[PDB]
Amino acid sequence: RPVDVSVSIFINKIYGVNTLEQTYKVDGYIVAQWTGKPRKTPGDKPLIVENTQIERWINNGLWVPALEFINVVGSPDTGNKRLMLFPDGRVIYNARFLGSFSNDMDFRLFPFDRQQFVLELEPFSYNNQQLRFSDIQVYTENIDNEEIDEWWIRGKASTHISDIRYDHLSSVQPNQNEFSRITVRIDAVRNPSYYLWSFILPLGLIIAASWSVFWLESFSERLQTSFTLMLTVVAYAFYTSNILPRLPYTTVIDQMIIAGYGSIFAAILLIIFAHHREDDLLIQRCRLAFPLGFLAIGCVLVI
Amino acid sequence: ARPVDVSVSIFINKIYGVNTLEQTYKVDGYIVAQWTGKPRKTPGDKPLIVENTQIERWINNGLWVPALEFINVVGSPDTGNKRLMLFPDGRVIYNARFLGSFSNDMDFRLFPFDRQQFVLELEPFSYNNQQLRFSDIQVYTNEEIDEWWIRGKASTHISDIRYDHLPNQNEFSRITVRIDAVRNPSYYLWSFILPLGLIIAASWSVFWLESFSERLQTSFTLMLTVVAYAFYTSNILPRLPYTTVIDQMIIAGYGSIFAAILLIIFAHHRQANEDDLLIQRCRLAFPLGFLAIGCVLVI
Amino acid sequence: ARPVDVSVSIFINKIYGVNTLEQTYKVDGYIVAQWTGKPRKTPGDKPLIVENTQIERWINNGLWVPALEFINVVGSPDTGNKRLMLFPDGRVIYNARFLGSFSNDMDFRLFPFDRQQFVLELEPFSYNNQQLRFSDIQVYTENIDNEEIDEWWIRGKASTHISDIRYDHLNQNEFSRITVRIDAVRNPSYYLWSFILPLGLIIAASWSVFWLESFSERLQTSFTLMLTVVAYAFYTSNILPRLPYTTVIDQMIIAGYGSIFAAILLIIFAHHRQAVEDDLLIQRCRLAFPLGFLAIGCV
Amino acid sequence: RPVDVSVSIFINKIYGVNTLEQTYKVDGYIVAQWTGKPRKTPGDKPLIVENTQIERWINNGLWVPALEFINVVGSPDTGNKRLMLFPDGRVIYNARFLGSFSNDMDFRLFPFDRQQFVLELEPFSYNNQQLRFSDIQVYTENIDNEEIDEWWIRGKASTHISDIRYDHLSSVNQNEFSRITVRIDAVRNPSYYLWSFILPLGLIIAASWSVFWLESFSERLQTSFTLMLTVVAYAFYTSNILPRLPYTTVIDQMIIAGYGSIFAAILLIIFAHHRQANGVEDDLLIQRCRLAFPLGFLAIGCVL
Amino acid sequence: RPVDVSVSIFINKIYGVNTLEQTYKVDGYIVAQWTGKPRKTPGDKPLIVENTQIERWINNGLWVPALEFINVVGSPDTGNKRLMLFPDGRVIYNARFLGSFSNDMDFRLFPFDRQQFVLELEPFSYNNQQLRFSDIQVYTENIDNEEIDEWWIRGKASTHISDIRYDHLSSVQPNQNEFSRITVRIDAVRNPSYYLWSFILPLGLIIAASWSVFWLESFSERLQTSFTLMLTVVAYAFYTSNILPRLPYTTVIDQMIIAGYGSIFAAILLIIFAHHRQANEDDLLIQRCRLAFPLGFLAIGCVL
Amino acid sequence: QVQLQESGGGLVQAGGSLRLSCAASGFTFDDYTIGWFRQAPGKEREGVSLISSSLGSTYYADSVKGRITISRDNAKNTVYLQMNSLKPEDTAVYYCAAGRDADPTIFAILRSEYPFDYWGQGTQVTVSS
Ligand SMILES: [Ca+2]
Ligand SMILES: [Ca+2]
Ligand SMILES: [Ca+2]
Ligand SMILES: [Ca+2]
């Protein structure tokens, strides 16, 4: 009959987010408990088998199933391992792990993006007719000093035990293709404090200051200053790119940089148009029309 | 003694970590290999599962598990969980998770519009096609979020590699998998190509200035803007031993500004003494001349 | 039965490789653990030394060597030479060199004047306080006389605690935990002279916009000023550690943006809001602007 | 009677050149063949011993000498290993390897530098009286699409078997070891550096000479500061991409020449405006050095 | 009666200096020789035991003491290992190693700093009453092509065999708390050619050209130009920081960049002071400080 | 399945000799360290003699040294424990253990009984007069 396995995962740390790879590091413990055939433990007390010695018990016939992290990128770093063998037959496997996990992550709303760190566990060789997950318990520590952390864990870990029906199953034949899978989801929100005050705020001042070109008296002053403005945006796009994470798409900050280029370029066209088509009264006094026109297009960027 | 027929199945979970200069890419997936050996008496006449550490113990006892090498892998791949499914009739199924860095000839000259094909080359390490033969191969593989866009289902081919610099036992069966992909150019178009276009276009507005001193001094601020942009590009764009599309645009930017400097000086110093009417009013000829040369860059 | 008393001694050789974003730091040192087990018949009734590879062989033959885990270590640490000193009476002394990356809650908001405490948390991996207990802890930090050249200044001999950790989600739920704390202060010399001081000069020099005669000179210069702050914001970001919050230097950069931006609006306000008549007080704010900035600086 | 060992090295890839460390990565196979005592293999056919099983045979008495890569930086990454044991007594060791190798590399001529990637092989414990290298064969895959490759392998291969004498040994006498030396000549692909670094730099330096075409002294001096700033911005664009070295390259010298040219022009601009009979009388020849300055620079350029 | 151990260390390469971590990589060989109980070697000739086979001899009773690198940062990469067992009883342990070593390093004089690469060896478990180091021999090479190298080794290795007394030790056996320690020191000087020509020299030209502000005619020209000068120093500080090694203190180059900021800032104050502090009237001598400002700077430069 | 079939025990007259036999089956004999143990009534099971093939190690208890000789025979996958000049003290249940990682050299110090994966049923050896 299917072996019921009770799992408990302790998450110690979630860090090392790789934006381009869509990977993140998770440090914690994994506990698995199942009941086997009763054993004759020394003095009828639970027997502890640590690390190297675990393999010796397996060689002698102890059944220790391999549980694979479906979404782990490469073999995880396993710390200390232990087997607690009870005389009644129940076995408790406990091990420390650090692994790089993968999940579909959308950073388009950066620096206001919300992600969910997922862990997918499943037996490597035994279907749900042989091994089934009875329950899952996830324990996340509290973010004591949340202001100091890069990510803010919002939701207490979500858990779900599902059954994945694998298609191409070699020599399984009747029904050796349903596998029990534990799925853990930890919701988190990025800390945008740094990006708001050091990236969004100064950029706003740069774009706003670029509109002051219309307050200049001479055409030669309006056009020459706009090149210093253009150079300021380039210098800022560079300051942004060197710090911001690399992605295959544009973020909120990136779009602001593009808007900055557009605003300065549009102003250059207006400056030339007014002077070569006696300066136009309305065009030269667009000191109020240009910022409002930009803010109007800016509202569409949000909605 | 006919060759041992080996049925292979590769499951690709992730293709990432493209290293432009090394021409490498990382591949995470599973490898399944099935062959039929001598029958066994599995305990209880049911398939026997042998996991990880125990696999080596069976090999020490005489179990034949051939080494299959990834021809194009850069260093030993990271093997996760391993498994052997031993059937009573003699058939053996080897299943293992792997993560390896693979190499292939990659051309990034069309960056950010380059199209690449991720290849996997498998082959037995010690057994020729007279001893071990690959019978068949099966490959199993929200696109807006991904850096690369996988086009079609993986291509597969089983060939025979003849080693010249070693009877007729010099041929090895090789599985070759090819996965076509196209780069997501959205980011590079809007944050690199588009602003660069505006910088180059805005550089042509130097001809709309009234004074020669204004035309020449401004061109230096323009020259400095291209340098600042070439730096912004280089720091983000991947390192390569050749120029890309963006790199050529940067070179064209240098040329346009430098050509304008020559025109600005030529118009002000080559006359009867008097700015040449046509040269100073090249406000339309300079952009069209650039666009004309720009079209040749594509064709 | 009674708990096995374990006397621990930790020698700290080096603390380096602080990763700001990960809140991690590397620690090199030795770990010594002493306990009394079942007596042995050592050769010539003299202490027996068992090194490295041989330690595992003794464990296979029945020697009880409990696994002591570093609670706050990020990934398995790099263990150098290992040694077991087996006494005839039953004493066992385990000694090993280690290098590990440890984690702790670190606040870098006061950078470059932040103070941190590097922590080490030790605990048996499988034996509770009823089976294995820590009797005492002694930490040996080395006195750094050449403290001028070190990045961090270890301020005070290590703090030590031996507590009992109760685990709710498992009366055998309590484990003996050693907690080591090493207080340290960052060396701010480099950041003061190369990052704070020049910035002060840039922010002060920006106030000389009001000393310019013409409105066109005052406004155009303000754009060269705004570009100088951006260039400095970049020289800072490329060197300074990446964090999810602003530091002291970051706030100074933000203040620089504010000062220049406020000056731009004052320069325009003075020249366009009148009965071309620059307000006598507003354009002579050469003294009011720096004092107003220093006042906000004190807050 | 020294044991004759025939070696064959297959080079699959040469990459990951570290300029400062003078290191490079090499992926390939190593084949070593020698003849030992005859054996009775299953069905008198060559016996294949793969990976893990090789160590089992060594424990039982099979002599497998350790061949060390003299110039490898750290233990190389050994992939699949194999031993082909023949009944007549001959043994063939085959193994895949990936290693970081060191050699004296000079990058002063960058980006037009020519390097030679070397592999030095030698037995770790057996001298030439015990183990000798009989021959060496090196095989290289032809880089047909060399336009894509960062390095262009010129020479097919060079090999040499020498004898290294050590003037300090345990045996208070046999102090000579057989060493295989492989050399692969390569030339860097300078296309990228010519079009994206050399060419734009040329335009920057040339455009800096146009300061003499300005009318006013105030225009000539103020513009030269924008020129000076352009070279600094370019030196930064160069440094961030170009490899780090303990010496200057060709590009580095060009950037230095740029600093010198602009600085020399600043001195000339001031000298012409302040050294005259009047208060403001620009020397006719000095201000019309629009042709003398580029030729003077090109003259210095040609000798360097 | 302590076991006398003769050590010989061969240094092949010293590279990968990590400024912030105060570490340096060292590739080489380690040879240790001691005399034990005579053995019955095959054919009474020295017996070679390589790598995996060493562990087998240890399991059977062979005494091979663990010699630890005191100042190594993490477990070093041990290549091929070898035991040469003589019939008379003498044992020779030879192994290749690559390790990251630590030492107190001062880079305040960068790029003219002089460092000494140290190696500290000591038995891991045996005190000087059990195991003593009799002698040490260090064999470095003779770098003839030093110009290509980042570091210049000056003079042959220094050696020191001493006794380290630990106060807080395990056992109380009177006078058994001392361990024999080998200390090797290799002096080296940084190659400053690159930093002199690409960092010091251009910086000198930037600072010197910054003094040309006083040669401008108009106050508006003097003040606006100084902002372009200020921006040039920032552009240079950035070019410097991105290439120069990270340190917790300022170097010579860093101080020059600070001096550059001071000079420009002082000139800004002088430019404003001359134009606004008068009877009505740009000061004659202060604006003609075109010679006093550079000499005042050079005076402060020499004092520094 | 692993079977350590023991034989050669039973009743013996004081001062006599006896040769024990342990027929090992169900495992690769050579890469193991078969040995013999004994447990007298109301006394803890002690180690007698252990012979390993992988090593050249052979343990002999102090209470039996000089009157015992253990030997191996891989041809028949058996271990022979010959005990001469017996005593009534030798009376005990003689078990035959076999461990993979058991070292007779380390056993002389530890006297663990931990590295023995497989154990025999035991043969009674009684000595009297
Ligand atoms: Ca995806
Ligand atoms: Ca925390
Ligand atoms: Ca050298
Ligand atoms: Ca120190």
Numbering used by the authors:
A (entry chain E): 10 to 286, 292 to 317
B (entry chain D): 9 to 149, 154 to 178, 183 to 289, 292 to 317
C (entry chain A): 9 to 178, 184 to 288, 291 to 314
D (entry chain C): 10 to 181, 184 to 315
E (entry chain B): 10 to 289, 292 to 315
F (entry chain K): 1 to 129
Cite, word for word, the article reporting this structure.
The nAChR is a member of a superfamily of pentameric LGICs (pLGICs), which play major roles in fast synaptic transmission in the central and peripheral nervous systems, and are the site of action of many therapeutic drugs. Using the prokaryote ion channel ELIC as a model system, we investigated whether nanobodies could be selected with allosteric modulator activity on ligand-gated ion channels. We discovered functionally active nanobodies, which act either as a PAM or NAM on ELIC, and determined co-crystal structures to elucidate the nanobody interactions with ELIC. The pores of both Nb complexes resemble previous structures of ELIC, with narrow constriction points at the 9ʹ, 16ʹ, and 20ʹ positions, suggesting that the channels are in non-conducting conformations.
The structure of ELIC in complex with NAM-Nb was determined at a resolution of 3.25 Å and is structurally distinct from the complex with PAM-Nb: instead of five Nb molecules bound to the ELIC pentamer, here a single NAM-Nb molecule is bound to the ELIC pentamer. The NAM-Nb binds at the channel vestibule entrance and near to the N-terminal α-helix of a single ELIC subunit, and is oriented in such a manner that only a single nanobody molecule can bind at this interface, as the core of the nanobody sterically hinders access to the four other sites. The interaction interface is remarkable in that a unique α-helical region within the CDR3-region (P104-L110) forms the interface with ELIC. This α-helical region is positioned perpendicularly upon the α’1-helix in ELIC (N60-N69) and forms the outer rim of an allosteric binding site previously identified as the vestibule binding site. Conversely, the NAM-Nb acts as a negative modulator, whereas flurazepam acts as a positive modulator at the vestibule site. In contrast, co-application of a range of NAM-Nb concentrations demonstrates that NAM-Nb decreases the agonist response with a pIC50-value of 6.89 ± 0.03 (IC50: 0.13 μM) and Imax = 34 ± 2% (n = 6). Unlike competitive antagonists, which fully inhibit the agonist response at saturating concentrations, the inhibition of NAM-Nb levels off at 70% of the response with GABA alone, consistent with the mode of action of certain NAMs. Further analysis of the central channel axis of the NAM-Nb complex reveals a partial blockade of the extracellular vestibule entrance by the nanobody, resulting in a radius profile comparable to the 6’ pore constriction. This partial constriction of the ion permeation pathway could possibly explain why the NAM-Nb only partially inhibits GABA-induced currents.
